[PDB]
Amino acid sequence: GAENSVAYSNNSIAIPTNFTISVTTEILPVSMTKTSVDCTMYICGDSTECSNLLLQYGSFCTQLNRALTGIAVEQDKNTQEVFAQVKQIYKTPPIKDFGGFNFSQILPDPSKPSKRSFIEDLLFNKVTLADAGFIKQYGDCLGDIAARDLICAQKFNGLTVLPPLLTDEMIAQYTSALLAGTITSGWTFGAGAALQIPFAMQMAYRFNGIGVTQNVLYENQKLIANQFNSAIGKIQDSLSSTASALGKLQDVVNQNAQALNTLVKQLSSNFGAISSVLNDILSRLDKCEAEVQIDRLITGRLQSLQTYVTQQLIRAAEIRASANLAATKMSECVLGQSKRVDFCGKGYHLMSFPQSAPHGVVFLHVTYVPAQEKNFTTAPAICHDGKAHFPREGVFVSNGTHWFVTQRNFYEPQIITTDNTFVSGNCDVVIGIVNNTVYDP
Amino acid sequence: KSFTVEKGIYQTSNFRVQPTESIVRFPNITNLCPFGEVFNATRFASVYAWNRKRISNCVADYSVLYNSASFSTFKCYGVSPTKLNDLCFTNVYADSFVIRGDEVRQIAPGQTGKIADYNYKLPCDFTGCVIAWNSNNLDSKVGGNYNYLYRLFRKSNLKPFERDISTEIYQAGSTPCNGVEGFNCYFPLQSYGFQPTNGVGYQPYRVVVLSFELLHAPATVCGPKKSTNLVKNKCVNFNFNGLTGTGVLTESNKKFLPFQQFGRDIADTTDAVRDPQTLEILDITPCSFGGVSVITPGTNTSNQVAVLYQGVNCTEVPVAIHADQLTPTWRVYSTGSNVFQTRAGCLIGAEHVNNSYECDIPIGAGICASYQTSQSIIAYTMSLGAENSVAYSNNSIAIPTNFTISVTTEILPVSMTKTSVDCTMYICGDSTE
Amino acid sequence: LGKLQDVVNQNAQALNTLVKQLSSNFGAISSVLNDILSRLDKCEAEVQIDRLITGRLQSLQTYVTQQLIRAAEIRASANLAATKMSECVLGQSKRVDFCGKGYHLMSFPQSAPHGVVFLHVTYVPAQEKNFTTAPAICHDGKAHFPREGVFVSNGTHWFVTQRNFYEPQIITTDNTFVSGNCDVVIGIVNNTVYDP
Amino acid sequence: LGKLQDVVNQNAQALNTLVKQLSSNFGAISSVLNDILSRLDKCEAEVQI
Ligand SMILES: *[C@@H]1O[C@H](CO)[C@@H](O[C@@H]2O[C@H](CO)[C@@H](O)[C@H](O)[C@H]2NC(C)=O)[C@H](O)[C@H]1NC(C)=O
Ligand SMILES: *[C@@H]1O[C@H](CO)[C@@H](O[C@@H]2O[C@H](CO)[C@@H](O)[C@H](O)[C@H]2NC(C)=O)[C@H](O)[C@H]1NC(C)=O
Ligand SMILES: *[C@@H]1O[C@H](CO)[C@@H](O[C@@H]2O[C@H](CO)[C@@H](O)[C@H](O)[C@H]2NC(C)=O)[C@H](O)[C@H]1NC(C)=O
Ligand SMILES: *[C@@H]1O[C@H](CO)[C@@H](O[C@@H]2O[C@H](CO)[C@@H](O)[C@H](O)[C@H]2NC(C)=O)[C@H](O)[C@H]1NC(C)=O
Ligand SMILES: *[C@@H]1O[C@H](CO)[C@@H](O[C@@H]2O[C@H](CO)[C@@H](O)[C@H](O)[C@H]2NC(C)=O)[C@H](O)[C@H]1NC(C)=O
Ligand SMILES: CCCCC/C=C\C/C=C/CCCCCCCC(=O)O
Ligand SMILES: *[C@@H]1O[C@H](CO)[C@@H](O)[C@H](O)[C@H]1NC(C)=O
Ligand SMILES: *[C@@H]1O[C@H](CO)[C@@H](O)[C@H](O)[C@H]1NC(C)=O
Ligand SMILES: *[C@@H]1O[C@H](CO)[C@@H](O)[C@H](O)[C@H]1NC(C)=O
Ligand SMILES: *[C@@H]1O[C@H](CO)[C@@H](O)[C@H](O)[C@H]1NC(C)=O
Ligand SMILES: *[C@@H]1O[C@H](CO)[C@@H](O)[C@H](O)[C@H]1NC(C)=O
Ligand SMILES: *[C@@H]1O[C@H](CO)[C@@H](O)[C@H](O)[C@H]1NC(C)=O
Ligand SMILES: *[C@@H]1O[C@H](CO)[C@@H](O)[C@H](O)[C@H]1NC(C)=O
Ligand SMILES: *[C@@H]1O[C@H](CO)[C@@H](O)[C@H](O)[C@H]1NC(C)=O
Ligand SMILES: *[C@@H]1O[C@H](CO)[C@@H](O)[C@H](O)[C@H]1NC(C)=O
Ligand SMILES: *[C@@H]1O[C@H](CO)[C@@H](O)[C@H](O)[C@H]1NC(C)=O
Ligand SMILES: *[C@@H]1O[C@H](CO)[C@@H](O)[C@H](O)[C@H]1NC(C)=O
């Protein structure tokens, strides 16, 4: 990266005088495809003799089905714990009098039949084969036999994709509830019932939270609002242009589809048998050698299924980790203001907004970034009349002529007074103290 | 694999359907095969000049051979002999010759000796079968037949199914003898002496090797079975050109090349067949369509259930499930009054309810089911929760005046059982071997 | 205590599945080593027993793999429990909904078979009242903002109140602070500020 | 720095176990492909391999 050398000195401080309000998009997978498998059909193409031979294994694919059902239940659990943080389905007021902040892009659009917002619509467009499962209805596999779609081969070999419990509309409704609570009630709708608060005052709370006084909001409200709106516009273009915006989700989709395709391809292996087709074996050999060849094939295909289930358990563990992270982010950044650094964006965290996405969630972290800075001459304390003065909040600063106190993250100089500072002992122990006079009102 | 099922929705294996009928469809050919020419021949060829005969447009009855001919050895590789009636053979060649009795063992894959290296070699990956019978009363005369010759010397062993009828003098020694006989170079072909009185191992044996390959090409030599009709749109035990399987056969649209009869998908199972009689194309599908999930309150509560079929259209459920092949206890669940078409699929056995409750048994796609009391199973779109609309205004604030001190229990697992395994005892029950 | 009982059940079920999987032939003539070793001589006993050994070793490998998955999950839960004990028992956590629904006061641990139980004691504001608010107060041309709390009105007079409890107190110099003139802030109202 | 050295050891041990597991017969006549391919003709070489 760019080599840099900060101009550190023992009495020089860089204080900001201006800021920016950034909006950072960041995307977490939450769930994956609730795959299910019929062991009998996959291993044996509904032939009686192979089924009879598979009968004496029995416990193996009982275990496999148990594992896959656990995975599916875990996926539903993941989605619920991420999105169903609350249960009171709040709705936005008809009036969007939010102090100049424009939420139309993220709030629901009632014109569309589905209540996805604009950004959620873009996100659902960016991921290609999200569903590719339960949507595929029979008859298409018998009507469009010419195309030879992968899903049809998966269905004919017992590999099905179960539908998620929460539909996209229901998840979007949860998201709308979270948004409405965030932008009307502040953080209080997580800690018990939802209160109400004017949005500008909620913003003032957040600014007071990140250690800058509330007044600079009121003094720069319109500007801040404009900045926020512009940031949203930048998101509305940034994820609209490129195609790899939602890579992390599309990769998950691809892994699941690829795994199923590898399984139906692995059906083509001999596994040491005379042929990979049960029908050839059962039409070319009498009972006993058919038993032994079919046993070889059964063991091989059961091994392939066990491999698939093991990889699915690995991937489900990873998705559960990501879903736990998403739940923590929704709890700590949507439902409240997080003091943890770089947990919810690059900069001091103001708020976050959730947006649904296919098999995942998207957080728009709105954050405060100090932008323009000025050098100043500082000193850790002030000696007035033999006693030392230290600031309660802020640091001592000088423009070259006079000294003031300033809050850490914004240049708001104000004259030295008794109430700005406090006194602790004589001024002959502290290093770097300077002389000045302290106004007493 | 237990009686007491608990409350929930379970994915269950497709045992409901059972086949009921068999279909045999063999080509309309009736010419009995030339058994007379390759078995009842006046004279066979010498082993070094073994005679190859194409065979096509046959019906391999081979019960006619039971009447007269008795075969000392009849070994079949790649096919179990009991199945030879249930098959159609594509590229059938008969390789006929005569040897002595002791060398009949050399007509087999992976053998070595005079016959297996210098005269007649079979490949390792040999599909086909070998017949040999003693012929002392035909191919041996007093004084000894010398019409049967074998190649005694060769510089290198033969490749499979390779003939070598050269008669150049074999230079055994290191001095070339320029095309004449004498010392240290011999005439390679030596004549069997088949007296009618010598031992069994020096008695002439006639051998025919039938070489063919199976279930990959248009088969012209068919078995002696009797064809039946074609039952489509119903899952049957089909036997097409010996390819024996079970499934539903339907019409299709594939541009098969003239030299192809079987089509295979990515899984390599056969999917497209060409009917031998009427040169059309058929597609084979399974008759367990796929997911059939069963929804139930757990036993110790009741014994009623519902059934979801994933992805089917509620109109076409009975044909995809093949309800006509099922018992009435299944046909009640195939279709009834309690039809519901979810985007997850078709649900039968529970009445749809326009209300919305926080739900017990999830089904999918926003649908849940529960066993309510009207003591049956209901299905509904699950309720997200209480709709609310906070009364936001730009100068109104809700401040609390009182509080509560709640205590919330929440439970985390920390450890699990420290299991240990002795591999030797588990795998081997303390047996030494 | 479902979450613990499920763990117990998974471990027991896994072991039961293993001893049940001992009953499989794995392509051998029988699933019993004694039958094989009493019906066959050396060489075919070797090959049948090798088939059985490979099958049972595969079953054991499957068991160990599933145990590793489950142990990873338990380690994740144990790391979460350690973090909760550190951040909520040993201290007061500001993270929202980490240690109960509401503002976190404390937590108490309790042991349990193969797990831990946290009693999170938390503060939940219960009864609320509407009020007319304003972000600031213009006294004599300058704007007044509260240090801690928000400006509130019951309809007649204005007070400052801490965020999470209605404790109104009269406007004074020490309750508020001044920043510039009162012609830039939106929503400011007029009132008088007591000076002691 | 045990926690890191253990990771290193696990990776090295895993690779060593793999190259040691190359020495198993797995029910074949021998664990060496060269022995199998020099003692048997095509078909039984196919099945052993
Ligand atoms: C702080 O930064 C903002 C820009 O991020 C400045 O606002 C812009 O100022 C220029 C000229 O004054 C205008 O042309 C722009 O229209 C303003 N941007 C917006 C979004 O309104 C602002 O002037 C800076 N404040 C200080 C004290 O320097
Ligand atoms: C919030 O931002 C949008 C711009 O993205 C403002 O303009 C709307 O843009 C959309 C799509 O371009 C149109 O469907 C709307 O008709 C536009 N609004 C109007 C009044 O025409 C939108 O106005 C902004 N919201 C507010 C309250 O100002
Ligand atoms: C700050 O002010 C005090 C007194 O005004 C200074 O203290 C004197 O410094 C001179 C420097 O030589 C000494 O000669 C005196 O003896 C000191 N008198 C006392 C009472 O301390 C002090 O030096 C000043 N410090 C700075 C950084 O300006
Ligand atoms: C096929 O014909 C070739 C050529 O005659 C044979 O290869 C030669 O065999 C002789 C005797 O072993 C050698 O002296 C030559 O060096 C070989 N020439 C080449 C180019 O290989 C070959 O042995 C014959 N194949 C069979 C199965 O008989
Ligand atoms: C708060 O008080 C000030 C002065 O008492 C008001 O300012 C005057 O408002 C009237 C309204 O028409 C104007 O005619 C005067 O020109 C204003 N004088 C000055 C010095 O500003 C102010 O309007 C009051 N604001 C509220 C919300 O009550
Ligand atoms: C001196 C005795 C032999 C010493 C060498 C021992 C073993 C290796 C040679 C093995 C071949 C044995 C003779 C087989 C002859 C061909 C038989 C046939 O194909 O018809
Ligand atoms: C502060 O001083 C250093 C060196 O004098 C200089 O490099 C730096 O640019 C100054 N900071 C700003 C914001 O100008
Ligand atoms: C520094 O601050 C004082 C305070 O009034 C001001 O008078 C002076 O002009 C300022 N000087 C510079 C260089 O900013
Ligand atoms: C700060 O650094 C300078 C030289 O780099 C030194 O002269 C000065 O004494 C230092 N300030 C203090 C309080 O020590
Ligand atoms: C065979 O021959 C006739 C004429 O090609 C054809 O119509 C018939 O369907 C075929 N099958 C049988 C059993 O005759
Ligand atoms: C073969 O020959 C014998 C007598 O020569 C005769 O009885 C028999 O029917 C013939 N069998 C065949 C298949 O031609
Ligand atoms: C099971 O049956 C017994 C006796 O009827 C009853 O006490 C118990 O509550 C039942 N438990 C469940 C889960 O149904
Ligand atoms: C099949 O499902 C579709 C819904 O997309 C429906 O329009 C159609 O009517 C159904 N087919 C029949 C025969 O009902
Ligand atoms: C349920 O809602 C549908 C659609 O409005 C309607 O057709 C049906 O009559 C309703 N049934 C009941 C019992 O309310
Ligand atoms: C506050 O005002 C709204 C509408 O005037 C009302 O619905 C709500 O009940 C009020 N809040 C309380 C605690 O009464
Ligand atoms: C509002 O607060 C003032 C402060 O004294 C009080 O006098 C008045 O009675 C209160 N009015 C209402 C409606 O609460
Ligand atoms: C608050 O909303 C009302 C109408 O909804 C509006 O008249 C009023 O001007 C708004 N308050 C401010 C400070 O803009």
Author numbering:
A (entry chain C): 700 to 1140
B (entry chain A): 304 to 676, 689 to 748
C (entry chain A): 945 to 1140
D (entry chain B): 945 to 993
Reproduce text from the manuscript describing this model.
The spike (S) protein of coronaviruses is responsible for interaction with cellular receptors and fusion with the target cell membrane. The S protein of SARS-CoV-2 is a large, 1273 residue, type I fusion protein, that can be processed by host proteases into two parts, S1 and S2. The spike (S) protein of SARS-CoV-2 has been observed in three distinct pre-fusion conformations: locked, closed and open. To overcome this challenge, based on the locked SARS-CoV-2 S-R/PP structure, we engineered cysteines residues replacing positions D427 and V987 to generate a new disulfide-stabilized S protein S-R/x3.
We additionally introduced a D614G substitution into the S-R/x3 spike to obtain S-R/x3/D614G. Therefore, we determined the structure of the S-R/x3/D614G spike. The proportion of locked conformations is greatly reduced compared to S-R/x3, constituting only ~19% of total particles. Classification did not identify two different locked conformations of the S-R/x3/D614G –all locked spikes were in the locked-2 conformation. As in the S-R/x3 locked-2 structure, residues 617–641 are ordered, and linoleic acid is bound confirming that the D614G spike retains the ability to bind linoleic acid, a molecule that has been suggested to be important for regulating conformational state of the spike. We suggest that substitution of negatively charged D614 to neutral G alters the local electrostatic interactions, preventing R634 binding between F318 and Y837, and triggering the 617–641 loop refolding. This would provide an explanation for the absence of the locked-1 conformation in S-R/x3/D614G. The absence of the locked-1 conformation with interdigitated domain D in constructs containing the D614G substitution is likely due to the change of electrostatic properties caused by the D614G substitution. Instead, D614G-containing spikes adopt the locked-2 conformation which is more prone to transition away from the locked state towards closed and open conformations. For the D614G spike, based on which all variants of concern were evolved, only the locked-2 conformation was observed.
